[PDB]
Write a protein that holds these residues in place. Structure first.
Motif, short mmCIF file in Angstrom:
data_model
loop_
_atom_site.label_atom_id
_atom_site.label_comp_id
_atom_site.label_asym_id
_atom_site.label_seq_id
_atom_site.Cartn_x
_atom_site.Cartn_y
_atom_site.Cartn_z
N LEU A 59 -17.33 -23.93 50.76
CA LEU A 59 -16.11 -23.17 50.46
C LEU A 59 -15.84 -23.11 48.96
CD1 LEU A 59 -13.44 -21.78 51.54
CD2 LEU A 59 -12.42 -24.04 51.30
N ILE A 60 -16.16 -21.96 48.37
CA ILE A 60 -16.14 -21.81 46.93
C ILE A 60 -14.92 -21.03 46.52
CG2 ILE A 60 -17.43 -21.05 44.91
CD1 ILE A 60 -19.89 -20.85 46.90
N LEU A 61 -13.99 -21.71 45.86
CA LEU A 61 -12.80 -21.09 45.29
C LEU A 61 -13.00 -20.86 43.81
CD1 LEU A 61 -10.11 -23.21 47.17
CD2 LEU A 61 -11.55 -21.31 47.97
N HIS A 62 -12.45 -19.77 43.29
CA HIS A 62 -12.63 -19.42 41.88
C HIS A 62 -11.86 -20.38 40.97
CE1 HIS A 62 -13.18 -17.11 38.25
NE2 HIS A 62 -13.95 -16.26 38.91
N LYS A 63 -12.59 -21.06 40.09
CA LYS A 63 -12.03 -22.04 39.14
C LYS A 63 -10.82 -21.53 38.33
CE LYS A 63 -15.80 -20.97 35.87
NZ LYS A 63 -15.11 -19.82 35.24
N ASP A 64 -10.82 -20.23 38.03
CA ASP A 64 -9.74 -19.58 37.29
C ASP A 64 -8.62 -18.95 38.13
OD1 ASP A 64 -10.87 -20.16 34.68
OD2 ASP A 64 -12.40 -18.67 35.16
N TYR A 65 -8.55 -19.27 39.42
CA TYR A 65 -7.42 -18.82 40.22
C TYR A 65 -6.04 -19.26 39.67
CZ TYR A 65 -4.09 -18.22 43.99
OH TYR A 65 -2.97 -17.87 44.73
N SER A 66 -5.15 -18.30 39.47
CA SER A 66 -3.74 -18.55 39.25
C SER A 66 -2.84 -17.53 39.92
CB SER A 66 -3.42 -18.57 37.77
OG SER A 66 -3.88 -17.40 37.17
N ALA A 67 -1.61 -17.91 40.21
CA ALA A 67 -0.68 -17.00 40.83
C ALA A 67 0.78 -17.14 40.42
CB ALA A 67 -0.82 -17.06 42.33
N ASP A 68 1.53 -16.07 40.58
CA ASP A 68 2.97 -16.03 40.39
C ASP A 68 3.62 -16.00 41.74
OD1 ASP A 68 1.40 -15.10 38.40
OD2 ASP A 68 2.36 -13.13 38.25
N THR A 69 4.90 -15.71 41.78
CA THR A 69 5.59 -15.43 43.04
C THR A 69 5.07 -14.14 43.67
OG1 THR A 69 7.48 -15.91 41.64
CG2 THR A 69 7.79 -15.97 44.00
N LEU A 70 4.50 -13.29 42.83
CA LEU A 70 4.04 -11.99 43.21
C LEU A 70 2.54 -11.81 43.19
CD1 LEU A 70 6.16 -9.14 42.66
CD2 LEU A 70 4.10 -8.79 41.41
N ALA A 71 1.95 -11.95 42.03
CA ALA A 71 0.59 -11.53 41.79
C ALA A 71 -0.42 -12.65 41.81
CB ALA A 71 0.51 -10.80 40.47
N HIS A 72 -1.63 -12.36 42.25
CA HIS A 72 -2.67 -13.37 42.31
C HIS A 72 -3.88 -12.98 41.51
CE1 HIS A 72 -0.89 -15.53 45.93
NE2 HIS A 72 -0.07 -14.54 45.66
N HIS A 73 -4.38 -13.89 40.70
CA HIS A 73 -5.43 -13.63 39.73
C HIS A 73 -6.74 -14.31 40.08
CE1 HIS A 73 -2.40 -12.34 36.58
NE2 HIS A 73 -1.67 -12.81 37.56
N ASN A 74 -7.85 -13.65 39.87
CA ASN A 74 -9.15 -14.19 40.29
C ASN A 74 -9.17 -14.58 41.77
OD1 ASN A 74 -10.58 -13.97 37.74
ND2 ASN A 74 -9.31 -15.69 37.00
N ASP A 75 -8.50 -13.77 42.58
CA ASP A 75 -8.25 -14.11 43.98
C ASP A 75 -9.48 -13.73 44.79
OD1 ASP A 75 -6.89 -15.11 46.16
OD2 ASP A 75 -5.56 -13.34 46.32
N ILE A 76 -10.50 -14.57 44.69
CA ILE A 76 -11.80 -14.32 45.28
C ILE A 76 -12.44 -15.64 45.68
CG2 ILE A 76 -13.00 -14.34 43.05
CD1 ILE A 76 -14.83 -12.17 44.21
N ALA A 77 -13.09 -15.63 46.83
CA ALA A 77 -13.66 -16.83 47.41
C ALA A 77 -14.89 -16.48 48.21
CB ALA A 77 -12.65 -17.53 48.29
N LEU A 78 -15.74 -17.49 48.39
CA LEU A 78 -16.93 -17.34 49.18
C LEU A 78 -16.99 -18.45 50.18
CD1 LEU A 78 -19.28 -16.58 46.23
CD2 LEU A 78 -19.10 -15.11 48.27
N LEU A 79 -17.48 -18.11 51.35
CA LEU A 79 -17.68 -19.07 52.37
C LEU A 79 -19.11 -18.93 52.82
CD1 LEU A 79 -14.59 -17.95 52.64
CD2 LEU A 79 -14.67 -19.23 54.72
N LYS A 80 -19.82 -20.03 52.93
CA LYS A 80 -21.18 -19.98 53.38
C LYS A 80 -21.14 -20.42 54.79
CE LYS A 80 -25.78 -21.68 52.64
NZ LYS A 80 -26.72 -22.07 51.59
N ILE A 81 -21.60 -19.58 55.67
CA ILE A 81 -21.54 -19.85 57.07
C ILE A 81 -22.81 -20.28 57.72
CG2 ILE A 81 -19.59 -18.37 57.39
CD1 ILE A 81 -21.72 -16.28 58.38
#
Ligand SMILES: N=C(N)NCCC[C@@H](C=O)NC(=O)CNC(=O)[C@H]1C=CC(=O)N1
Length: 246
Positions: A81-103
């Protein structure tokens, strides 16, 4: 999805339905995702931020219904489960909102294409279609933003890509939308993605081919005027994707 129509997995055979196991044995729906290769599903980091344990999740492919089984569905666990190291968010907007799952299946296998399961193509680097282009979004998300329940059947709808210069407008999102995001909305604002649709695909036809142009991220409300859907912009994350799927 607000408005649009009901559909089946065959019309969106890359859609991945992602659930979380609840300690004490109950399982609930988390988010959508897209099958970009046999062993990899791509989704949104914020889907997983509060529970980063890969062991907590199950991924279904080939699944048309939320809480009941679809013939031909395949079930997987998350090996990575790979979450983007640079993920940040506000009450509204989400940044670098990308993830990978290896199944991987308990049997140990990655997904196998069928009537109900296909991979979706990535775009070429920095290559998105022009504003005005009609794309489609798919999800198990709310049919209206006030609902308590999610629909039991998969839905899809069509939305048109908006300009950054336009999504930039104050009436719209201003500062909140960046170049790592794309905006889409109905021209009359009648159809849109809503909570529960996050992680899911924004699919546009690019070079005669259905292509994963976006990932459902955020918006202000669902199907509200002047407030388009915002999507993680896949074409600006290929190096992250290739690196993390090597
Ligand atoms: N396309 C629209 N309008 N919305 C997509 C909603 C997707 C949803 C999936 O979990 N994403 C989020 O909830 C992220 N957070 C939000 O959208 C915040 C911003 C306004 C609000 O009501 N909640």
């Amino acid at each position: 999805i607000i408005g649009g129509e009901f559909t089946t997995i065959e019309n969106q055979p890359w859609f991945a339905a992602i659930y979380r196991r609840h300690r004490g044995g109950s399982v609930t729906y988390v988010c959508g995702g897209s099958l970009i290769s046999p062993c990899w599903v791509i989704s949104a980091t914020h889907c997983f931020i509060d529970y980063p344990k890969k062991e907590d999740y199950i991924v279904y492919l080939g699944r048309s219904r939320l809480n009941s089984n679809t013939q031909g569905e395949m079930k997987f666990e998350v090996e990575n489960l790979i979450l983007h190291k640079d993920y940040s968010a506000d009450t509204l907007a989400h940044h670098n909102d990308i993830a990978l799952l290896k199944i991987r299946s308990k049997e140990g296998r990655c997904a196998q294409p069928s009537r109900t399961i296909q991979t979706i193509a990535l775009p070429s680097m920095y290559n998105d279609p022009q504003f005005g282009t009609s794309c489609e979004i798919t999800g198990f998300g709310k049919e209206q933003s006030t609902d308590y329940l999610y629909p039991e059947q998969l839905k899809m709808t069509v939305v048109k890509l908006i300009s950054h210069r336009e999504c930039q407008q104050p009436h719209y999102y201003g500062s909140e939308v960046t170049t790592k995001m794309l905006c889409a909305a109905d021209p009359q604002w009648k159809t849109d993605s809503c909570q529960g649709d996050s992680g899911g695909p924004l699919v546009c036809s690019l070079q005669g081919r259905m292509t994963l142009t976006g990932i459902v991220s955020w918006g202000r409300g669902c199907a509200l005027k002047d407030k388009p859907g915002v999507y993680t912009r896949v074409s600006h994350f290929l190096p992250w994707i290739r690196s993390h799927t090597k």
